[PDB]
């Protein structure tokens, strides 16, 4: 009661600035920065015949 300060905690909600764990071999999650750093440099397959 009184002056009540409500944030995402007392409602058990995710923060606006929140991040999930990176995906593992058996877990689903964010894609890691170095995963993309490996992906982009990986040249696309060459289409010949």
């Amino acid at each position: 009661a009184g002056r009540v300060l409500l944030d995402a905690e007392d409602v058990h909600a995710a923060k606006k600035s929140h991040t999930h764990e990176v995906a593992t071999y058996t877990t689903d999650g964010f894609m890691s920065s170095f995963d993309k750093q490996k992906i982009d440099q990986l040249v696309s397959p060459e289409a010949g015949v």
Binding site: T24, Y25, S33, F34, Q37, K38, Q41
Partner: protein
């Protein structure tokens, strides 16, 4: 905040956890700013026929930041324990990342268990 910063540098962030022969073609890249001290590589025993990463006979190597700068994209040879001398591993290392070589496929009995940064 300073304590948290130094501790987070010390504990490091895993770059790759799993197992692979680290042969020709495979490579890993990262932002250079993530490197503050160096890189660490952990290897283990492997099975060529079964392709399952046995967990024993590990071997660790550590490369510092100054050595990393001096070895920008250069070659490093790491020997590993065995019943007989051989089964070396060749890697191309750099401050931004690492690569492989077409000799680690010959020595399929051992594989790069993991690589971490700190």
């Amino acid at each position: 905040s300073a304590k948290d910063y130094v501790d987070t540098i010390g504990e490091g962030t895993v770059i790759f956890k799993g197992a692979n022969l680290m042969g020709a073609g495979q490579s890993f890249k990262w932002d250079a700013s993530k490197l503050k001290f160096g890189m660490t590589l952990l290897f283990s025993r492997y099975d060529a026929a079964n392709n399952t990463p046995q967990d024993y006979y590990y071997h660790s190597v550590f490369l510092s930041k100054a050595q990393l700068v001096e070895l920008a994209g250069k070659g490093i040879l790491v020997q590993m324990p065995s019943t007989t001398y051989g089964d070396r591993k060749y890697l191309y290392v750099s401050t931004t990342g690492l690569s492989g070589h077409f000799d680690n496929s010959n020595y399929a009995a051992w594989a790069l268990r993991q690589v971490t940064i700190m």
